[PDB]
Design a protein around this ligand. Structure first.
Ligand SMILES: Nc1ncnc2c1ncn2[C@@H]1O[C@H](CSCC[C@H](N)C(=O)O)[C@@H](O)[C@H]1O
Length: 347
């Protein structure tokens, strides 16, 4: 006897050699159609020219029954090995160049996407997933009293809490409720290395206490942390307990308003002020410092001189003899820097 045709039809051992040719204008619609129908060939790459896109397909008879122009073409094989290093390696420059910076916090990727390229959301997500296989959440960043970033989940688990690893500590965060910038890992380590055992240190605006955690992880010191957001305070308490067996130093968490709390504290060897953008806490934080102040601010590159001058002015106003050094910590916007004034109080 013989076989049923609908059993034989799947035996062909060779590869798929055809694709459909569509106007770029119709490319998205057609990609969706081909996926829906089930004949999109994952084994090969699509290509494009000035006016046309060619998608690889698995069944040219079904393609024709979709009204599509079938062509015979040698399309590239899908890559088996990936050597992507940057997001730019995975996107058209016209898309990539419009993206804000990409941050990884725990297993969450955060990216800024202007409305203007929101139509490219799917390839953007694809690119990020490829570059970061382990991330489970991709969120779109808006803008930052508690300085929470506006965030919308655009791929993955519908959550914004995670645990981030940095400088030998564990930091629980919930990005829907608290501020956290992973890019400050350098600064936090830097200050931790400058600190000497036996210091008493004050960190106003402490968030989920990443600065105190890193400092205390490396130095036997006492750190006071002041934070007004009760969600951040809660997470800070949990972070203290989560890291307790690896800290050399001690941390005291105070829930309160810096501008109410600090006038009622004793003074400290060192003050570290990760100031909220736009807020001026220089007088108050310097007033709590006996030997060092590390005061963060955001300054236009044409105003740096004036910034240094104002810091020295406030030093004189408080009767302190100081040397002031201003460092560019990071590029914030074009022509605008996150800076740190390192103030050494002389005796
Ligand atoms: N008056 C005030 N008193 C105490 N904390 C304040 C405050 N105004 C703003 N904040 C807190 O200041 C923080 C600034 S963000 C810096 C967070 C943390 N130091 C870090 O390095 O990630 C936010 O957590 C915000 O809730």
């Amino acid at each position: 006897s013989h076989h049923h045709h609908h059993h034989l039809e799947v035996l062909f051992q060779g590869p798929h050699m055809s694709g459909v040719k569509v106007r770029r204008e119709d490319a998205k619609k057609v990609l969706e159609l081909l996926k829906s129908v089930g004949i999109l060939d994952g084994k090969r790459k699509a290509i494009r020219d000035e006016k046309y896109v060619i998608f690889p397909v698995t069944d040219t008879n079904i393609a024709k029954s979709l009204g599509l122009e079938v062509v015979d073409v040698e399309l590239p094989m899908r890559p088996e090995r990936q050597i992507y290093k940057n997001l730019e390696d995975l996107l058209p420059r016209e898309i990539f160049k419009k993206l804000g910076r990409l941050d990884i916090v725990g297993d969450i990727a955060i990216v800024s996407i202007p409305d203007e390229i929101l139509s490219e959301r799917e390839v953007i997500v694809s690119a990020i997933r490829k570059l970061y296989p382990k991330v489970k959440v991709i969120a779109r960043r808006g803008f930052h009293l508690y300085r929470i970033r506006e965030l919308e989940v655009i791929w993955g688990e519908n959550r914004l809490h995670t645990i981030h690893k940095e400088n030998g500590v564990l930091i629980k965060v919930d990005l829907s409720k608290v501020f956290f910038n992973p890019r400050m890992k350098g600064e936090r380590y830097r200050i931790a290395q400058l600190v000497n055992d036996g210091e008493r240190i004050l960190v106003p605006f402490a968030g989920v206490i990443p600065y105190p955690l890193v400092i205390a992880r490396f130095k036997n010191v006492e750190v006071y942390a002041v934070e007004i957001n009760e969600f951040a305070v809660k997470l800070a308490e949990e972070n203290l307990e989560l890291n307790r067996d690896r800290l050399k130093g001690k941390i005291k968490i105070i829930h309160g308003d810096v501008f109410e709390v600090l006038p009622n504290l004793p003074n400290f060897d060192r003050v570290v002020s990760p100031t909220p953008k736009g807020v001026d806490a220089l007088s108050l934080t310097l007033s709590k410092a006996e030997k060092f102040l590390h005061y963060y601010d955001f300054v236009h590159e044409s105003e740096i001189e004036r910034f240094r001058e104002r810091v020295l002015e406030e030093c004189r106003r408080q009767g302190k003899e100081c040397r002031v050094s201003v460092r560019k910590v990071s590029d914030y916007k074009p022509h605008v820097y996150k800076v740190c004034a390192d103030v050494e109080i002389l005796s």
